[PDB]
Nucleic acid binder design. Structure first.
Ligand SMILES: [Mg+2]
Ligand SMILES: [Mg+2]
Ligand SMILES: [Zn+2]
Length: 462
RNA sequence: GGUCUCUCUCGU
RNA sequence: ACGAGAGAGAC
Protein backbone atom coordinates (compact mmCIF):
# COMPACT_ATOMS: atom_id res chain seq x y z
CA UNK A 1 0.00 0.00 0.00
CA UNK A 2 1.26 3.44 -0.94
CA UNK A 3 -0.09 6.98 -0.48
CA UNK A 4 -0.68 8.50 -3.93
CA UNK A 5 -1.34 12.16 -3.17
CA UNK A 6 -2.34 14.42 -0.34
CA UNK A 7 -4.54 17.44 -1.00
CA UNK A 8 -5.96 20.12 1.38
CA UNK A 9 -9.68 19.73 2.14
CA UNK A 10 -10.26 23.12 0.48
CA UNK A 11 -9.04 21.58 -2.78
CA UNK A 12 -11.06 18.32 -2.64
CA UNK A 13 -14.07 19.95 -1.04
CA UNK A 14 -14.16 17.36 1.74
CA UNK A 15 -15.46 18.12 5.24
CA UNK A 16 -12.74 18.06 7.89
CA UNK A 17 -12.63 15.06 10.21
CA UNK A 18 -11.08 15.74 13.60
CA UNK A 19 -11.00 13.02 16.24
CA UNK A 20 -10.13 13.17 19.93
CA UNK A 21 -6.56 13.79 21.15
CA UNK A 22 -6.97 12.86 24.83
CA UNK A 23 -7.09 9.21 25.90
CA UNK A 24 -10.05 7.75 27.81
CA UNK A 25 -7.58 5.66 29.79
CA UNK A 26 -6.69 6.46 33.39
CA UNK A 27 -4.70 4.33 35.84
CA UNK A 28 -7.07 2.00 37.74
CA UNK A 29 -7.24 1.08 41.43
CA UNK A 30 -4.99 -1.89 40.51
CA UNK A 31 -2.29 0.12 38.69
CA UNK A 32 0.26 -0.27 41.52
CA UNK A 33 -0.91 -3.73 42.56
CA UNK A 34 0.40 -5.30 39.33
CA UNK A 35 3.51 -4.71 37.16
CA UNK A 36 3.08 -3.47 33.59
CA UNK A 37 4.93 -1.68 30.81
CA UNK A 38 2.11 -0.37 28.61
CA UNK A 39 0.61 3.14 28.57
CA UNK A 40 -2.00 4.75 26.32
CA UNK A 41 -1.02 5.26 22.68
CA UNK A 42 0.16 8.64 21.41
CA UNK A 43 -2.94 10.50 20.17
CA UNK A 44 -1.47 13.99 19.73
CA UNK A 45 1.65 15.24 17.91
CA UNK A 46 2.75 17.28 20.97
CA UNK A 47 2.92 14.28 23.31
CA UNK A 48 5.82 14.71 25.79
CA UNK A 49 6.60 10.98 25.41
CA UNK A 50 7.26 11.23 21.66
CA UNK A 51 10.79 10.77 20.27
CA UNK A 52 9.92 11.17 16.56
CA UNK A 53 7.65 13.26 14.35
CA UNK A 54 4.20 11.90 15.10
CA UNK A 55 2.42 12.10 11.75
CA UNK A 56 5.37 10.64 9.94
CA UNK A 57 5.50 7.61 12.24
CA UNK A 58 1.71 7.20 11.79
CA UNK A 59 1.83 6.87 7.99
CA UNK A 60 5.16 5.11 7.68
CA UNK A 61 3.23 1.84 7.47
CA UNK A 62 2.50 2.58 3.78
CA UNK A 63 5.83 1.06 2.72
CA UNK A 64 5.09 1.12 -1.00
CA UNK A 65 3.95 -1.42 -3.57
CA UNK A 66 5.59 -4.24 -5.46
CA UNK A 67 3.27 -6.32 -7.71
CA UNK A 68 0.00 -5.06 -9.22
CA UNK A 69 -1.00 -8.19 -11.15
CA UNK A 70 -0.70 -11.83 -10.08
CA UNK A 71 2.29 -13.96 -11.04
CA UNK A 72 1.80 -17.64 -11.77
CA UNK A 73 2.42 -18.58 -8.14
CA UNK A 74 -0.30 -16.28 -6.86
CA UNK A 75 -2.72 -17.42 -9.60
CA UNK A 76 -2.29 -21.05 -8.60
CA UNK A 77 -2.60 -20.11 -4.92
CA UNK A 78 -5.77 -18.08 -5.54
CA UNK A 79 -7.33 -20.97 -7.47
CA UNK A 80 -6.45 -23.68 -4.96
CA UNK A 81 -8.03 -21.68 -2.17
CA UNK A 82 -11.07 -20.92 -4.35
CA UNK A 83 -11.63 -24.65 -4.96
CA UNK A 84 -11.39 -25.31 -1.25
CA UNK A 85 -14.17 -22.78 -0.61
CA UNK A 86 -16.58 -24.32 -3.16
CA UNK A 87 -17.66 -27.19 -0.90
CA UNK A 88 -19.07 -24.48 1.35
CA UNK A 89 -21.65 -23.57 -1.30
CA UNK A 90 -21.55 -19.87 -0.55
CA UNK A 91 -24.73 -18.08 -1.59
CA UNK A 92 -23.35 -15.44 -4.00
CA UNK A 93 -26.73 -13.78 -4.33
CA UNK A 94 -27.24 -10.31 -2.86
CA UNK A 95 -28.28 -10.05 0.78
CA UNK A 96 -31.41 -7.93 1.44
CA UNK A 97 -30.88 -4.43 2.77
CA UNK A 98 -33.00 -5.37 5.80
CA UNK A 99 -30.81 -8.37 6.71
CA UNK A 100 -27.66 -6.40 5.90
CA UNK A 101 -28.57 -3.54 8.24
CA UNK A 102 -30.32 -5.42 11.04
CA UNK A 103 -28.48 -8.71 10.99
CA UNK A 104 -29.10 -12.44 10.72
CA UNK A 105 -28.32 -15.55 12.77
CA UNK A 106 -24.70 -15.59 11.54
CA UNK A 107 -24.11 -11.93 11.06
CA UNK A 108 -24.50 -9.27 13.75
CA UNK A 109 -26.39 -6.08 12.94
CA UNK A 110 -24.62 -2.88 11.98
CA UNK A 111 -23.21 -1.44 15.16
CA UNK A 112 -25.50 1.43 16.13
CA UNK A 113 -23.19 2.38 19.01
CA UNK A 114 -20.54 3.41 16.50
CA UNK A 115 -19.88 6.37 14.10
CA UNK A 116 -21.71 6.65 10.77
CA UNK A 117 -18.57 7.90 9.03
CA UNK A 118 -18.37 10.50 6.26
CA UNK A 119 -20.31 12.75 5.74
CA UNK A 120 -22.73 12.14 8.65
CA UNK A 121 -19.92 12.47 11.21
CA UNK A 122 -19.51 16.12 10.26
CA UNK A 123 -23.23 16.59 9.66
CA UNK A 124 -23.95 15.53 13.24
CA UNK A 125 -25.93 12.50 12.07
CA UNK A 126 -25.86 9.26 14.03
CA UNK A 127 -26.65 5.77 12.74
CA UNK A 128 -29.64 5.87 15.07
CA UNK A 129 -31.10 8.82 13.16
CA UNK A 130 -31.20 6.56 10.10
CA UNK A 131 -31.68 3.02 11.38
CA UNK A 132 -34.03 1.57 13.97
CA UNK A 133 -33.77 -1.91 15.48
CA UNK A 134 -37.53 -2.10 16.23
CA UNK A 135 -38.99 -0.88 12.91
CA UNK A 136 -36.30 -2.56 10.85
CA UNK A 137 -37.05 0.41 8.62
CA UNK A 138 -34.81 0.38 5.61
CA UNK A 139 -36.19 3.33 3.58
CA UNK A 140 -34.29 6.08 5.42
CA UNK A 141 -31.18 4.16 4.32
CA UNK A 142 -32.12 4.17 0.60
CA UNK A 143 -32.89 7.85 0.70
CA UNK A 144 -29.34 8.40 1.89
CA UNK A 145 -27.94 5.72 -0.44
CA UNK A 146 -29.15 7.93 -3.31
CA UNK A 147 -28.25 11.20 -1.62
CA UNK A 148 -24.58 10.56 -0.88
CA UNK A 149 -24.03 7.46 -2.94
CA UNK A 150 -21.20 5.02 -2.45
CA UNK A 151 -17.41 5.07 -2.38
CA UNK A 152 -17.35 7.81 0.27
CA UNK A 153 -13.99 8.67 1.87
CA UNK A 154 -12.84 6.83 4.98
CA UNK A 155 -12.19 8.94 8.06
CA UNK A 156 -8.74 8.37 9.58
CA UNK A 157 -8.69 8.16 13.39
CA UNK A 158 -5.85 7.27 15.73
CA UNK A 159 -6.77 4.37 18.02
CA UNK A 160 -7.13 4.98 21.77
CA UNK A 161 -5.57 1.88 23.41
CA UNK A 162 -2.70 0.58 25.54
CA UNK A 163 0.61 0.10 23.67
CA UNK A 164 4.11 -1.01 24.61
CA UNK A 165 6.45 1.78 25.63
CA UNK A 166 8.62 1.27 22.57
CA UNK A 167 5.68 2.04 20.25
CA UNK A 168 4.88 5.17 22.21
CA UNK A 169 8.41 6.53 21.91
CA UNK A 170 8.23 5.79 18.19
CA UNK A 171 4.78 7.39 17.77
CA UNK A 172 3.60 4.19 16.14
CA UNK A 173 -0.07 4.38 17.12
CA UNK A 174 -2.60 2.41 15.10
CA UNK A 175 -4.71 4.06 12.41
CA UNK A 176 -8.25 2.94 11.73
CA UNK A 177 -10.40 3.97 8.76
CA UNK A 178 -13.99 4.77 9.69
CA UNK A 179 -16.18 3.48 6.89
CA UNK A 180 -19.11 5.52 5.68
CA UNK A 181 -22.32 3.71 6.70
CA UNK A 182 -23.33 3.60 3.02
CA UNK A 183 -20.38 1.46 1.93
CA UNK A 184 -20.73 -0.81 4.94
CA UNK A 185 -24.36 -1.31 3.87
CA UNK A 186 -23.54 -2.04 0.22
CA UNK A 187 -20.69 -4.44 1.05
CA UNK A 188 -22.83 -6.33 3.58
CA UNK A 189 -25.49 -6.55 0.87
CA UNK A 190 -22.90 -7.82 -1.57
CA UNK A 191 -21.07 -10.32 0.71
CA UNK A 192 -23.34 -10.96 3.71
CA UNK A 193 -23.89 -14.64 2.98
CA UNK A 194 -20.15 -15.14 2.53
CA UNK A 195 -19.82 -13.38 5.90
CA UNK A 196 -22.44 -15.77 7.35
CA UNK A 197 -20.69 -18.86 5.98
CA UNK A 198 -17.28 -17.77 7.25
CA UNK A 199 -18.68 -16.92 10.70
CA UNK A 200 -20.48 -20.27 10.95
CA UNK A 201 -17.48 -22.29 9.78
CA UNK A 202 -14.22 -21.45 11.53
CA UNK A 203 -11.56 -24.03 10.75
CA UNK A 204 -9.47 -25.26 7.88
CA UNK A 205 -12.12 -25.21 5.16
CA UNK A 206 -12.65 -21.46 5.31
CA UNK A 207 -9.02 -21.21 6.47
CA UNK A 208 -10.41 -18.71 8.98
CA UNK A 209 -10.87 -18.46 12.77
CA UNK A 210 -13.39 -15.64 12.62
CA UNK A 211 -16.34 -16.78 14.71
CA UNK A 212 -14.35 -19.31 16.74
CA UNK A 213 -14.70 -19.55 20.53
CA UNK A 214 -11.15 -20.09 21.92
CA UNK A 215 -12.57 -22.14 24.85
CA UNK A 216 -13.86 -24.92 22.60
CA UNK A 217 -11.98 -24.18 19.38
CA UNK A 218 -8.63 -24.73 20.91
CA UNK A 219 -9.26 -28.44 21.54
CA UNK A 220 -9.95 -28.90 17.82
CA UNK A 221 -6.88 -27.15 16.38
CA UNK A 222 -4.42 -30.00 17.07
CA UNK A 223 -6.87 -32.25 15.19
CA UNK A 224 -7.43 -29.74 12.36
CA UNK A 225 -3.68 -29.00 12.11
CA UNK A 226 -1.87 -32.37 12.15
CA UNK A 227 1.85 -32.62 11.30
CA UNK A 228 4.62 -30.01 11.56
CA UNK A 229 3.42 -26.65 12.95
CA UNK A 230 4.36 -23.26 11.62
CA UNK A 231 3.13 -19.75 12.49
CA UNK A 232 3.37 -16.09 11.51
CA UNK A 233 2.52 -12.61 12.36
CA UNK A 234 3.02 -9.66 10.04
CA UNK A 235 4.25 -6.15 10.69
CA UNK A 236 1.78 -3.60 9.36
CA UNK A 237 -0.22 -6.21 7.49
CA UNK A 238 -3.00 -3.98 6.19
CA UNK A 239 -0.78 -1.26 4.73
CA UNK A 240 1.80 -3.70 3.38
CA UNK A 241 -0.63 -5.38 0.98
CA UNK A 242 0.19 -4.52 -2.65
CA UNK A 243 -2.67 -4.36 -5.20
CA UNK A 244 -1.82 -7.82 -6.59
CA UNK A 245 -3.44 -9.40 -3.50
CA UNK A 246 -6.73 -7.61 -4.14
CA UNK A 247 -6.50 -8.87 -7.69
CA UNK A 248 -5.98 -12.36 -6.30
CA UNK A 249 -9.00 -11.86 -4.05
CA UNK A 250 -11.00 -10.98 -7.17
CA UNK A 251 -10.12 -14.25 -8.92
CA UNK A 252 -11.12 -16.19 -5.80
CA UNK A 253 -14.52 -14.50 -5.67
CA UNK A 254 -15.14 -14.97 -9.39
CA UNK A 255 -14.17 -18.65 -9.13
CA UNK A 256 -16.76 -19.33 -6.43
CA UNK A 257 -19.52 -17.65 -8.39
CA UNK A 258 -19.66 -13.90 -7.80
CA UNK A 259 -21.10 -11.72 -10.54
CA UNK A 260 -18.85 -9.25 -12.26
CA UNK A 261 -20.91 -6.58 -10.56
CA UNK A 262 -20.00 -8.04 -7.16
CA UNK A 263 -16.32 -8.65 -7.87
CA UNK A 264 -15.89 -5.04 -9.04
CA UNK A 265 -16.34 -3.82 -5.44
CA UNK A 266 -12.81 -5.09 -4.56
CA UNK A 267 -11.10 -2.25 -6.48
CA UNK A 268 -13.13 0.07 -4.26
CA UNK A 269 -11.12 -1.08 -1.24
CA UNK A 270 -7.83 -1.52 -3.14
CA UNK A 271 -8.04 2.14 -4.22
CA UNK A 272 -9.29 4.33 -1.40
CA UNK A 273 -9.51 7.96 -0.38
CA UNK A 274 -9.17 9.05 3.20
CA UNK A 275 -9.84 12.23 5.12
CA UNK A 276 -7.49 12.88 8.02
CA UNK A 277 -8.19 16.16 9.81
CA UNK A 278 -8.15 18.89 7.13
CA UNK A 279 -6.54 16.88 4.31
CA UNK A 280 -7.51 14.27 1.75
CA UNK A 281 -5.21 11.52 0.57
CA UNK A 282 -5.26 8.55 -1.78
CA UNK A 283 -4.03 5.10 -0.88
CA UNK A 284 -3.41 2.55 -3.61
CA UNK A 285 -3.08 -0.98 -2.25
CA UNK A 286 -3.56 -1.64 1.46
CA UNK A 287 -6.62 -2.88 3.36
CA UNK A 288 -8.62 0.07 4.56
CA UNK A 289 -8.84 -1.45 8.07
CA UNK A 290 -12.32 -0.43 9.13
CA UNK A 291 -14.15 -1.28 5.93
CA UNK A 292 -16.77 -4.01 6.11
CA UNK A 293 -15.22 -7.45 5.65
CA UNK A 294 -11.85 -6.39 7.11
CA UNK A 295 -11.21 -9.48 9.24
CA UNK A 296 -12.51 -11.78 6.56
CA UNK A 297 -10.75 -10.29 3.52
CA UNK A 298 -7.58 -10.04 5.55
CA UNK A 299 -7.98 -13.73 6.24
CA UNK A 300 -8.74 -14.76 2.66
CA UNK A 301 -5.85 -12.72 1.29
CA UNK A 302 -3.77 -14.45 3.98
CA UNK A 303 -4.75 -17.88 2.64
CA UNK A 304 -3.67 -16.88 -0.86
CA UNK A 305 -0.40 -15.49 0.46
CA UNK A 306 0.74 -18.57 2.40
CA UNK A 307 -0.01 -20.83 -0.55
CA UNK A 308 1.78 -18.54 -3.00
CA UNK A 309 4.88 -18.34 -0.77
CA UNK A 310 4.99 -22.08 -0.24
CA UNK A 311 5.02 -23.05 -3.88
CA UNK A 312 7.41 -20.26 -4.85
CA UNK A 313 9.86 -21.03 -2.03
CA UNK A 314 9.88 -24.80 -1.98
CA UNK A 315 10.01 -27.62 -4.50
CA UNK A 316 7.27 -30.23 -4.62
CA UNK A 317 4.86 -28.57 -2.24
CA UNK A 318 1.46 -30.20 -2.34
CA UNK A 319 -1.10 -27.54 -1.39
CA UNK A 320 -3.65 -30.26 -0.51
CA UNK A 321 -1.53 -31.17 2.50
CA UNK A 322 -1.65 -27.62 3.81
CA UNK A 323 -3.79 -26.98 6.83
CA UNK A 324 -4.06 -23.43 7.99
CA UNK A 325 -6.33 -21.19 10.00
CA UNK A 326 -6.05 -17.40 9.82
CA UNK A 327 -7.47 -14.50 11.85
CA UNK A 328 -6.55 -11.44 9.87
CA UNK A 329 -2.76 -11.66 9.65
CA UNK A 330 -2.52 -14.30 12.45
CA UNK A 331 -1.52 -17.71 11.16
CA UNK A 332 -1.45 -21.16 12.64
CA UNK A 333 -0.72 -23.85 10.10
CA UNK A 334 0.50 -27.38 9.60
CA UNK A 335 2.13 -29.50 6.92
CA UNK A 336 3.39 -33.10 6.72
CA UNK A 337 7.03 -31.87 6.88
CA UNK A 338 8.74 -28.97 8.71
CA UNK A 339 8.41 -25.62 6.96
CA UNK A 340 11.28 -23.16 7.12
CA UNK A 341 9.54 -19.92 7.96
CA UNK A 342 12.78 -17.97 7.49
CA UNK A 343 12.69 -18.80 3.75
CA UNK A 344 8.96 -18.04 3.44
CA UNK A 345 9.68 -14.69 5.07
CA UNK A 346 12.42 -13.97 2.54
CA UNK A 347 9.99 -14.55 -0.31
CA UNK A 348 7.36 -12.47 1.47
CA UNK A 349 9.80 -9.59 1.48
CA UNK A 350 9.88 -9.63 -2.34
CA UNK A 351 6.12 -9.08 -2.40
CA UNK A 352 6.35 -6.24 0.13
CA UNK A 353 5.39 -8.30 3.20
CA UNK A 354 7.18 -8.26 6.56
CA UNK A 355 6.59 -11.65 8.21
CA UNK A 356 7.68 -12.23 11.84
CA UNK A 357 7.53 -14.95 14.52
CA UNK A 358 4.03 -15.34 15.94
CA UNK A 359 5.23 -14.13 19.32
CA UNK A 360 7.43 -11.41 17.82
CA UNK A 361 10.48 -13.38 18.99
CA UNK A 362 13.70 -12.11 17.26
CA UNK A 363 14.02 -15.23 15.05
CA UNK A 364 12.07 -18.19 13.71
CA UNK A 365 12.38 -21.23 15.93
CA UNK A 366 10.69 -24.61 15.92
CA UNK A 367 6.95 -24.28 16.54
CA UNK A 368 5.11 -26.91 18.59
CA UNK A 369 2.01 -27.09 20.76
CA UNK A 370 4.03 -26.23 23.85
CA UNK A 371 5.21 -22.91 22.41
CA UNK A 372 2.55 -22.11 19.82
CA UNK A 373 0.38 -19.01 20.16
CA UNK A 374 -2.72 -17.96 18.25
CA UNK A 375 -4.70 -14.86 19.17
CA UNK A 376 -2.04 -14.26 21.90
CA UNK A 377 -3.10 -17.41 23.77
CA UNK A 378 -0.89 -20.55 24.09
CA UNK A 379 -2.00 -24.20 24.28
CA UNK A 380 -2.21 -26.08 27.61
CA UNK A 381 -3.60 -29.64 27.83
CA UNK A 382 -5.86 -30.05 30.87
CA UNK A 383 -4.17 -32.19 33.51
CA UNK A 384 -7.19 -34.51 33.91
CA UNK A 385 -8.44 -34.72 30.33
CA UNK A 386 -5.35 -34.13 28.14
CA UNK A 387 -7.44 -34.08 24.94
CA UNK A 388 -9.21 -31.00 26.24
CA UNK A 389 -6.91 -28.02 25.56
CA UNK A 390 -6.78 -24.77 27.57
CA UNK A 391 -6.39 -21.49 25.68
CA UNK A 392 -3.80 -19.70 27.80
CA UNK A 393 -3.66 -15.93 27.77
CA UNK A 394 -0.36 -14.96 29.44
CA UNK A 395 -0.86 -13.50 32.91
CA UNK A 396 1.42 -10.62 31.91
CA UNK A 397 -1.13 -9.56 29.27
CA UNK A 398 -3.99 -9.85 31.79
CA UNK A 399 -1.97 -7.61 34.16
CA UNK A 400 -1.60 -4.93 31.48
CA UNK A 401 -5.40 -4.71 31.08
CA UNK A 402 -6.39 -4.50 34.73
CA UNK A 403 -4.07 -1.54 35.43
CA UNK A 404 -6.09 0.93 33.39
CA UNK A 405 -9.74 1.82 32.86
CA UNK A 406 -11.81 4.15 30.69
CA UNK A 407 -14.52 4.29 33.33
CA UNK A 408 -14.20 2.80 36.85
CA UNK A 409 -17.92 2.26 36.71
CA UNK A 410 -17.22 -1.07 35.06
CA UNK A 411 -14.52 -2.36 37.36
CA UNK A 412 -16.58 -5.44 38.26
CA UNK A 413 -17.16 -6.36 34.61
CA UNK A 414 -13.60 -5.63 33.62
CA UNK A 415 -12.20 -7.79 36.46
CA UNK A 416 -14.67 -10.62 35.94
CA UNK A 417 -13.83 -10.78 32.22
CA UNK A 418 -10.11 -10.96 32.96
CA UNK A 419 -10.84 -13.72 35.48
CA UNK A 420 -12.57 -15.70 32.74
CA UNK A 421 -9.30 -15.39 30.79
CA UNK A 422 -6.85 -16.01 33.61
CA UNK A 423 -8.15 -19.28 35.09
CA UNK A 424 -6.94 -21.31 32.12
CA UNK A 425 -3.43 -20.69 33.36
CA UNK A 426 -4.36 -23.00 36.21
CA UNK A 427 -5.38 -23.07 39.89
CA UNK A 428 -2.13 -21.82 41.41
CA UNK A 429 -1.82 -18.88 39.01
CA UNK A 430 -5.51 -17.98 39.35
CA UNK A 431 -5.45 -17.74 43.14
CA UNK A 432 -2.26 -15.71 42.87
CA UNK A 433 -4.23 -13.28 40.68
CA UNK A 434 -7.34 -13.24 42.88
CA UNK A 435 -5.17 -12.67 45.96
CA UNK A 436 -3.60 -9.58 44.43
CA UNK A 437 -7.01 -8.18 43.47
CA UNK A 438 -8.25 -8.64 47.08
CA UNK A 439 -5.20 -6.89 48.53
CA UNK A 440 -6.88 -3.57 47.75
CA UNK A 441 -10.22 -2.19 49.16
CA UNK A 442 -12.19 -2.19 45.88
CA UNK A 443 -11.03 -5.76 45.20
CA UNK A 444 -12.74 -6.94 48.39
CA UNK A 445 -16.03 -5.52 47.01
CA UNK A 446 -15.71 -7.53 43.80
CA UNK A 447 -17.57 -10.70 42.82
CA UNK A 448 -14.83 -13.02 41.66
CA UNK A 449 -15.79 -16.32 39.98
CA UNK A 450 -14.74 -19.39 41.86
CA UNK A 451 -12.04 -21.52 40.15
CA UNK A 452 -13.97 -24.77 40.64
CA UNK A 453 -17.12 -23.47 38.95
CA UNK A 454 -15.14 -22.00 36.09
CA UNK A 455 -13.57 -25.38 35.39
CA UNK A 456 -16.89 -27.21 35.80
CA UNK A 457 -18.63 -24.89 33.36
CA UNK A 458 -15.77 -25.28 30.93
CA UNK A 459 -15.90 -29.10 31.05
CA UNK A 460 -19.64 -29.04 30.34
CA UNK A 461 -19.10 -27.12 27.13
CA UNK A 462 -17.97 -30.52 25.90
C1' G B 1 -12.83 7.53 17.99
C1' G B 2 -14.00 1.75 12.23
C1' U B 3 -14.88 -3.33 10.68
C1' C B 4 -15.83 -7.71 13.03
C1' U B 5 -15.72 -12.03 16.19
C1' C B 6 -16.02 -14.33 20.92
C1' U B 7 -17.31 -14.10 26.03
C1' C B 8 -19.43 -12.11 30.30
C1' U B 9 -22.81 -8.70 32.97
C1' C B 10 -27.56 -5.96 33.67
C1' G B 11 -32.46 -5.38 32.45
C1' U B 12 -37.58 -6.71 29.54
C1' A C 1 -35.87 -13.98 22.47
C1' C C 2 -35.12 -8.49 22.60
C1' G C 3 -32.63 -4.33 24.53
C1' A C 4 -28.28 -1.80 27.46
C1' G C 5 -23.27 -2.13 29.20
C1' A C 6 -18.42 -4.13 29.29
C1' G C 7 -13.69 -7.00 28.48
C1' A C 8 -10.68 -9.43 25.24
C1' G C 9 -8.71 -10.68 20.25
C1' A C 10 -7.31 -9.48 14.58
C1' C C 11 -6.40 -5.43 11.26
MG1 LIG D 1 0.60 -7.58 12.74
MG1 LIG E 1 -1.68 -10.42 14.34
ZN1 LIG F 1 -7.27 7.86 -5.54
Amino acid sequence: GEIQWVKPNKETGRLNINGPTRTKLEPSVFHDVFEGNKEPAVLHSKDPRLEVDFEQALFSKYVGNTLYEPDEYIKEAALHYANQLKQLDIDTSQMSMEEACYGTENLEAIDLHTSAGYPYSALGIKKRDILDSTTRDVSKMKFYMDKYGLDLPYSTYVKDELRSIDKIKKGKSRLIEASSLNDSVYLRMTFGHLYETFHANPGTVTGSAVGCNPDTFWSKLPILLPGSLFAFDYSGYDASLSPVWFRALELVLREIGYSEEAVSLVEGINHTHHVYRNKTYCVLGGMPSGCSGTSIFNSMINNIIIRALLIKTFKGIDLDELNMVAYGDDVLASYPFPIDCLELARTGKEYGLTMTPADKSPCFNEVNWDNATFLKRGFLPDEQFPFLIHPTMPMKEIHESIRWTKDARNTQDHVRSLCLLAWHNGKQEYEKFVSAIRSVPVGKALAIPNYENLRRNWLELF
